[PDB]
RNA sequence: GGGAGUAGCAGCAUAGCCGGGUGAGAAUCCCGGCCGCCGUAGGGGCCAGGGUUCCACGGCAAUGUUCGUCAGCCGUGGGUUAGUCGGUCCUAACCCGACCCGUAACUCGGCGUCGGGGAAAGGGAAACGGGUUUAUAUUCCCGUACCGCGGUGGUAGGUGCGGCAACGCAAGCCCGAGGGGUGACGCCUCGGGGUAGGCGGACCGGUCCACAAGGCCGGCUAAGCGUAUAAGCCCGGGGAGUGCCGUAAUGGCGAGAACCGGGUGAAAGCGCGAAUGGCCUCCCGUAAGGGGGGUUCCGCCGAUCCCUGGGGCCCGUGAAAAGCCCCUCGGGAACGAUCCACCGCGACCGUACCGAGAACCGACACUGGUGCCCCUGGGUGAGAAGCCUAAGGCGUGUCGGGGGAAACCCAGCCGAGGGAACUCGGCAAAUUGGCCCCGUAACUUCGGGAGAAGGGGUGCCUGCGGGUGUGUAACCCGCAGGUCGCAGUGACUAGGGGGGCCCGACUGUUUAGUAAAAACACAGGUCCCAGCUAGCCCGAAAGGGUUUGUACUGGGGCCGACGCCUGCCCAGUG
């Protein structure tokens, strides 16, 4: 193993070749999924992947269509309620 | 796979070209007065300064 | 010289250089062969062969294991490890209690059991007084639940 | 560099001849200080051909060496004969 | 537990002596017993780091002592500054 | 000990390499100065009157 | 002769420096050409552990969108709102000039001269008491005993410093002390001059005893001040 | 020169023999067979360092601990191909330059500001299989693909929808700013889902084997593109306490449980890639070249490799920035993509080989060190143990032939009868030894001592039962009877034990190369200085260390876990 490939940031895997060689393949690790700002709870609808994996995707498959998609829905409804209760004056 | 810099490689290349012996016609022309020179080197005896 | 032939043929046939056979009556033909084409055609002709792997049988161990399954070779004199190693500690517990919960849940689904009785038995099984389904059923039909 | 100074020498070895026959390639010895693009021009002018690819390596003698692939319209053997070999 | 006199300090074995092991066990007992929250009134406060306490049931995170969420001096200050 | 064996740990990065200004293997690479000419440390050249290297070079007398 | 650890500390080597790159930032209040009378309002958002403070810190977001670190008082919640200025209320976490602070109040993080940023009672568990309020000075009782005088325009914070009761549980082992002293690189372990050699210490010898009084004068030169320095007394009482 | 044709070319891995050849010449060069060593490394891969040692042809003056037709030696000619591998980019601990202050001065010393560097194992756009050469290949050829800039042409959109909701969608362009996320993180422990790898049974071909029964070999499928469920988290309905629901374990619930339905979401598998590929094998002349057949299934184990979730610990809190994605504002145009199809362009350097009981360092073809840095089939067995073995590699840990041919030495095996009478001293050797059951003292800081001690059992065969499980799959647990031996952990593996005294509480460290200890450290005990422009320290000065600090702190000394205790003198020196 090359010294850089022996570094535990490469998630090895052994794989069989049509001509019978049993090679070792190397891959980088995926990031973790996004988390709300106000509660630290995972977001749904936002997929995990490296910038390579993500730039081969259209916009609307990267986040939900509701407003404030950086927030969980319980917090989204809170901010919206606050806005409307303050827009009375 | 060895990861050398280019200047160092060129210097080793010169060092390799040097390490040969005197041609036969120089000896024939000098009447056996030149048979060697001071830069014969073997890789396992005398080392270079990179 | 024939080091060259041996290595070319070995890594052509995807083998080792010791599992290779060169006919001892045609070494001149082999030596006249400096290219890969010539060594290929000699392989074809059969002057250079890949030998078959020897192998290692398992025919004695098969009979050993047959006899062990049917119940020999498992006495005190054949053991070297502790009982808690040869059979684990937490594995036993997990398989036991999983079995028990499975059975209680099936019994509840078939109406034989009400929530009160199922809860009591769940709690006793966690406490760990049953140790097997036979004990469980003995308890249930000694007491009036079945 | 400038055309007509880039190319120093053509190669005549068994490997180079094999490549001339099979791949339609030429093999040259070149001034260290030239790049793939300058080599491309140089060949185009000094020989009036269209080039497809250039690959380079510096050797263990201090010489830059170029494997040059032409487009299948032309023919290496032609210029190899136009030269000596 | 299973032992009479030692508690959390039955891990040290026959080492380090009486006073040491007693103090350690008493302190860790009082710290690992659950505590009442000042926001929800429920007994679920647990330590997070040195000086930091958190309720598992409401999410209240606050600052306090090193081994208890209150100190005698803090109590005095609370009372005094409420009086004035 | 302090002999044969400790001298096997010499397959690490060197202390000195060649110098652009003088051509001599004396450039300390972890600091950026030559121990022979002062390059990387002085505009001018390191010379001294207790030293014989430059005199030997130019075939002068001591 | 040879040197002392005393003497090598004064040069500033990695064997003696502080590893401040490991810490959270410095803790100051605000510059007061900004705090004329405006009584800023802010919100706590996080409470955190600092390896260079023997006390927790708290992160605050102000109406400016600016973010600061304060030293956390005992009983401050994530989500509270603290005020900083002359006319703020009197509660826990609020910073005021000492003049506006009654007698009897517990106080921490006091400025020496108005504008410094907080010099006193910043260690974990500590507090100070306000004694008197004149028109030219305020008297304060510090955790040592001294009754110091401050100018009445100096700023303080109300309450007590969190982290208290840290020295009740013992350090049981030597590895734990290794880690405690590696956090901030204190010299650990420690030798004894009495078992050192005579080059290396005013004590020191084949016999493991001191042959001169351990009491040294405040006018003894460096390299010699080891033991009891200008001791008024010694012993038990 | 004598020593001397002597020592050494032994010890840690004791390896060669028969037949054939080449050649002037063969213990030691080549081919075949027999016999053998290694076998969690003496195998396979690759850093640093070395620098051509690599490859073929030709040679034998010298080198090679012997010979030599051999060679890491000598001669001649050759050999290292990148849009995707790595540098090149970002910052870290740290460093430099200019200005500034000091210095008699500087090539010296330094705080702050500014600017710049700093990782070939940290962060980080993108390629996989087959073949080709004497010597290169994720680099050349074939086949099948992917990124980033720029374009041409159409659509989505600007001027559109479905769901109560979670959410599902091709869902506008150029410029600037701001926010949010990811990058982005410790030690210990557990479960679940998968994979490499292995085992078994059937079958199709080939070979071994007196027949028979039987054993061994082969039965292959990459990146990419398209596809979904776990766990966790969420949405809606629903409306609970002598309670119910659940986990391996913690545990959950009017601050809204059970129970109904749903949504988002991994590693994998599947399909295409892909059968005139690759392997096994039967044929015609055997030279370029041809022909045919097969490429099948079920079941079990299962990681130290991959993915996902819980729990515990800290007077100890386990990096940053570049870059990438989303949203919102503010400003311009009226056109126009993050979707489909097509095209063009993508520089500079490395790239051979060893990688160590001969290619590095040690003056050497050195039993040392660097590197054991990353990986490892079957059996016995708790086991990456030791023993045997397959693969792969060697017979180059580079001097051989003889022999009752001795004395004596080095490393080993057994010794009647007595059992430490030996010796400063039981030094050396021997005894014991694995697993199950029974039974175990003084003393004690009640945690220990303790495997205390002391005792019995243990093979093969024929059978009977139990646990989990659908299991005449797999792994485990108890008992009877029969029989053989001097001996049943039969080899390998595998503690000798007890009773008193001194010192040190413990784990730890020490005189590299005559001392590992009763010496050092340690937890804890106590004393002294200091309220900060402090106390203590460096320095010629400027300036600095403790200090991104503030008496629950910083510094300076002695005793040294725990237990009971710590008596009199301030005349002397301080
Ligand atoms: Zn939220
Ligand atoms: Zn609460
Ligand atoms: Zn120089």
Containing C47, the helix (H) or strand (E) segment is: none
In angstroms, the CA F48 to CA G93 distance is 67
* Nearest residue to G156 (alpha-carbon basis) of G213, G116, G118: G118
G29 contacts G119 by C-beta, under 8 angstroms: no
Residue C39 in contact with residue C8, Cβ under 8 Å? yes
Phi-psi region of D40 (alpha: psi -120 to 50; beta: other; left: phi over 0): alpha
The C-alpha atoms of residue A61 and residue A45 are separated, in whole angstroms, by 8
Q: Are G110 and G155 in contact (CB under 8 A)?
A: yes
- Closest nucleotide to A31's CA, by C1' atom? H182
d(CA A79, CA C4): 79
Q: Any idea which residue has 């106000």 for tokens? A: A38
Within 8 A of B13 by CB-CB distance, chain D residues are 59-62
Contact: F14, B49; criterion CB under 8 Å: no
A87 in Cβ contact with A54 (< 8 Å): no
Distance CA D57, CA D20 (A): 18
The alpha carbons of chain D give a radius of gyration, in whole angstroms, of 12
Ligand closest to Cα of G77 equals 2
Helix/strand/coil for B14: helix
Contact between C113 and C122 (Cβ < 8 Å): no
Strand H near-CB residues (< 7 Å), C 8-47: 8, 10, 12-24, 27, 34-37, 40-41, 44-45
CA torsion sign, G98 to G103 to G107 to G109?
positive
Give the closest ligand to the alpha carbon of residue E69: 2
Q: Which residues of chain B neighbour D65 with C-beta distances below 8 Å?
A: none
Give the three-class secondary structure for C20.
strand
Strand F33-34, strand G40-48: pairing? unpaired
Q: Please name the helix (run of DSSP H) or strand (run of DSSP E) that holds residue G158, with its range, or none.
A: strand G155-158
Q: Which residues contact G137 (CB under 8 A, 6 or more apart)?
A: G149, G150, G151, G152
What are the CA-CA distances from residue B19 to residues A53, B39, D60, E45, F57 (Å)?
Answer: 54, 6, 13, 80, 25
Helix (H, G, I), strand (E, B) or coil at C22: strand
CA B7 to chain centre: 18
Inter-residue contact E23 to G169 (CB < 8 Å): yes
Give the residues across from G82 on adjacent strands: G42
List the beta strands (DSSP E) in F1-62: 16-17, 27-28, 33-34
Tell which phi-psi region holds residue C129, choosing left (phi > 0), alpha (psi between -120 and 50) or beta.
Answer: alpha
First to last CA, chain B: 18
Question: E60 CA to chain G: closest CA distance, Å?
Answer: 7
Ramachandran assignment for G16, one of left (phi > 0), alpha (psi -120 to 50 degrees), beta (any other): alpha
Please check if E47 is assigned to a binding site.
no
Quote the ligand 3 centre to F33 CA distance (angstroms): 8
Question: G173: helix, coil or strand?
Answer: coil
Distance of CA G144 to the CA centre of its chain: 12
CB A24 within 8 A of CB A12: yes
**CA A53, A59, A61, A62: dihedral to nearest 10 degrees?**
70
User: In chain B, which residues have their Cβ closer than 8 Å to the Cβ of D62?
Assistant: 10, 13-14, 17
Chain B CB contacts of D58 under 8 Å are 6, 9
Q: How many angstroms separate the alpha carbon of residue G46 from the centre of ligand 1?
A: 16
Count E/G contacts: CB-CB distance under 8 Å: 110
B32: left (phi over 0), alpha (psi -120 to 50) or beta: left
| C-beta of residue A17 within 8 angstroms of C-beta of residue A31 | no
Distance C115 CA to H141 C1' (A): 75
DSSP conformation class of G136: S
- What distance in Å separates the CA atoms of residue A14 and residue B9, rounded to the nearest whole number? 37
| Nucleotide in closest CA–C1' contact with C12 | H131
For residue E81, give the nearest of G56, G77, G158 by CB distance.
Answer: G158
Estimate to the nearest angstrom the gap between the alpha carbon of C33 and the chain centroid.
47
Q: Which two tokens stand for residue C124?
A: 């006793």
E6: CB partners within 8 A, 6+ apart = E21, E25
Task: Report whether E24 contacts E7 (CB < 8 A).
Answer: no
Q: Is A75 annotated as a binding residue?
A: yes
Q: How far apart are alpha carbons G68 and G59 in whole angstroms?
A: 6
Burial of B12 (0-12, 13-18, 19+ CB in 10 A): middle
CB G160 within 8 A of CB G73: yes
Q: What angle do CA C66, C67, C68 make, to 5 degrees?
A: 90
Could you give the dihedral angle defined by the CA atoms of residues C30, C32, C34 and C35, in that order, rounded to the nearest 10 degrees? -80
- Are the beta carbons of F14 and F6 closer than 8 angstroms? no
Q: Rounded CA gap, G162 and G44, in Å?
A: 15
Alpha-carbon distance D33 to nearest alpha carbon in chain B (angstroms) = 13
- Cα–ligand 1 centroid distance for A77 (angstroms): 10
E27, E61, E74: best mutation site toward chain G, by most G Cβ within 10 Å?
E74
Nucleotide at minimal C1' distance from the G176 CA: H316
Q: Does B16 touch chain D (CB under 8 A)?
A: yes
Coil, helix or strand at residue C85? helix
In this structure, are residues C74 and C44 in contact, taking their beta carbons and an 8 Å threshold?
Answer: no
Cβ–Cβ < 8 Å for F28, F46: no
Q: Which nucleotide is nearest to A43 (CA to C1')?
A: H233
- Inter-chain contact D60–B13, Cβ cutoff 8 Å? yes
Among the bound ligands, name the one nearest to the CA of residue E59.
2
Cis peptide before E44 (omega within 30 of 0): no
Contact assessment for residue G204 and residue G196, using Cβ atoms and an 8 Å cutoff: yes
**F34 labeled binding residue:** yes
A83 touches strand H (CB under 7 A): no
Q: Is the CB of residue G97 less than 8 Å from the CB of residue G138?
A: no
Identify the residue whose tokens are 């299948």.
D72
Interface test with B, best of D56, D58, D62 (most B CBs within 10 A): D62
**Resolution value (Å, 1 decimal):** 3.0
Q: What angle do CA G221, G225, G226 make, to 5 degrees?
A: 160
In what side-by-side order are the strands of the sheet with E35-36? E35-36, E43-49, E52-55, E61-63
- Give the count of beta carbons closer than 10 Å to the beta carbon of residue G92: 19
Strand H at less than 7 A from CB of E24: no
Technique used to solve these coordinates: cryo-EM
Measured CA to CA in angstroms, residue D68 lies from C97, D6, D25, D58 at distances of 74, 14, 5, 15
Whether the CB-CB separation of E35 and E45 falls below 8 Å is answered with yes
> Of C2, C1, C3, C9, whose CA–CA distance to C36 is shortest?
C9
What DSSP state is assigned to residue F11?
A: -
What is the CA(B47)–ligand 3 centre distance, in A?
21
The alpha carbon of E81 and the centre of ligand 2 are apart by a number of angstroms equal to 24
Distance B28 CA to H205 C1' (A): 73
Q: What is the spatial distance between Cα E55 and Cα E36, in angstroms, rounded to a whole number?
A: 9
C-alpha gyration radius of chain E = 16
Whole-angstrom Cα Rg for chain C:
34
Q: How far is the CA of G196 from the CAs of C141, G2, G210, in angstroms?
A: 82, 11, 12
Give ion ligand 2 contacts, CB < 5 A: E 37, 39-40, 55, 58, 60
3-state secondary structure of G42: strand
């Amino acid at each position: 193993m090359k010294p850089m490939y022996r570094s535990r940031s490469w998630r090895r895997k052994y794989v069989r070749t049509p001509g019978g060689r049993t090679v070792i393949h190397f891959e980088r690790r995926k990031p973790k999924v996004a988390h709300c700002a106000m509660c630290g709870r995972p977001l749904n609808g936002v997929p995990r992947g490296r910038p390579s994996e993500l730039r081969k995707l259209p916009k609307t498959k990267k986040r939900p269509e509701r407003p404030y998609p950086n927030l969980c829905p319980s917090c989204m409804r809170k901010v919206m309620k606050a806005q409307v209760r303050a827009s009375i004056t | 796979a060895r990861n050398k810099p280019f200047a160092k490689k060129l210097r080793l290349a010169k060092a390799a070209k040097q390490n040969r012996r005197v041609p036969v016609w120089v000896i024939v022309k000098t009447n056996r007065k030149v048979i060697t020179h001071p830069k014969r080197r073997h890789w396992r005896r005398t080392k270079l300064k990179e | 010289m024939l080091k060259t032939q041996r290595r070319i043929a070995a890594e052509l046939l995807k083998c080792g250089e010791n599992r290779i056979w060169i006919d001892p009556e045609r070494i001149e033909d082999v030596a006249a062969a400096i290219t890969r084409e010539d060594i290929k055609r000699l392989i074809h002709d059969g002057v250079i062969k890949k030998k078959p792997i020897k192998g290692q049988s398992r025919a004695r161990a098969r009979a050993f294991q047959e006899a062990r399954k049917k119940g020999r070779h498992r006495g005190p004199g054949s053991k070297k490890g502790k009982k808690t190693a040869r059979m684990g500690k937490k594995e036993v517990w997990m398989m036991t209690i999983r079995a028990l919960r499975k059975e209680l849940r099936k019994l509840k689904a078939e109406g034989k059991l009400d929530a009160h009785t199922y809860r009591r038995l769940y709690i006793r099984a966690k406490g760990g007084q049953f140790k097997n389904k036979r004990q469980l059923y003995m308890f249930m039909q000694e007491h009036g639940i079945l | 560099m400038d055309p007509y100074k880039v190319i120093i020498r053509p190669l005549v070895t068994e490997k180079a001849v094999s490549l001339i026959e099979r791949e339609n390639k030429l093999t040259f010895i070149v001034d260290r200080r030239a790049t793939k693009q300058d080599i491309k021009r140089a060949v185009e002018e000094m020989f009036n051909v269209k080039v497809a690819k250039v690959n380079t390596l510096v050797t263990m003698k201090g010489e830059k060496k170029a494997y040059v692939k032409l487009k299948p319209e032309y023919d290496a053997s032609e210029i190899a004969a136009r030269l000596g070999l | 537990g299973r032992t009479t006199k030692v508690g959390s300090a039955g891990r040290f074995g026959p080492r380090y002596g009486l006073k040491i092991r007693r103090r350690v066990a008493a302190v860790e007992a009082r710290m690992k017993q659950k505590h009442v929250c000042p926001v929800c009134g429920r007994k679920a406060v647990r330590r997070i780091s040195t000086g930091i306490w958190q309720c598992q049931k409401c999410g209240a995170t606050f600052a306090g002592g090193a081994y208890l969420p209150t100190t005698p001096a803090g109590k005095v200050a609370k009372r005094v500054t409420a009086s004035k | 000990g302090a002999g044969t064996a400790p001298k096997g740990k010499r397959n690490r990065t060197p202390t000195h390499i060649r110098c652009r200004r003088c051509g001599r293997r004396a450039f300390n690479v972890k600091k950026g100065y030559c121990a022979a000419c002062g390059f990387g440390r002085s505009r001018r050249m390191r010379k001294y009157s207790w030293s014989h290297k430059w005199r030997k070079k130019r075939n002068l007398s001591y | 002769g040879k040197s002392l650890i005393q003497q090598r500390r004064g040069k500033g080597t990695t064997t003696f420096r502080a590893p401040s790159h490991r810490y959270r930032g410095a803790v100051r209040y605000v510059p007061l050409n900004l705090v004329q009378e405006r009584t800023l309002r802010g919100v706590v958002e996080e409470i955190l552990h600092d390896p260079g403070r023997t006390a927790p810190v708290a992160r605050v977001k102000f109406e400016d969108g600016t973010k600061k670190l304060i030293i956390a008082p005992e009983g401050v919640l994530v989500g509270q709102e603290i005020y900083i200025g002359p006319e703020a209320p009197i509660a826990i976490g609020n910073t005021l000039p000492l003049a506006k602070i009654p007698e009897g109040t517990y106080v921490y993080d006091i400025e020496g001269v108005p504008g410094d940023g907080g010099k006193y009672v910043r260690a974990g568990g500590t507090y100070a008491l306000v004694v008197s309020r004149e028109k030219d000075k305020v008297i304060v009782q510090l955790p040592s005993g001294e009754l110091k005088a401050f100018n009445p325009m100096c700023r303080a914070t109300i309450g007590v410093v969190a982290g208290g009761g840290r020295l009740e549980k013992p350090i049981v082992k030597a590895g734990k002390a290794y880690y405690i002293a590696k956090a901030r690189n204190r010299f650990w372990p420690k030798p004894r001059g009495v078992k050192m050699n005579a080059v290396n210490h005013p004590h020191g010898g084949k016999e493991h005893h001191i042959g001169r009084p351990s009491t040294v004068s405040r006018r003894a030169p460096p390299g010699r001040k080891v033991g009891h320095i200008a001791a008024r007394r010694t012993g038990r009482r």
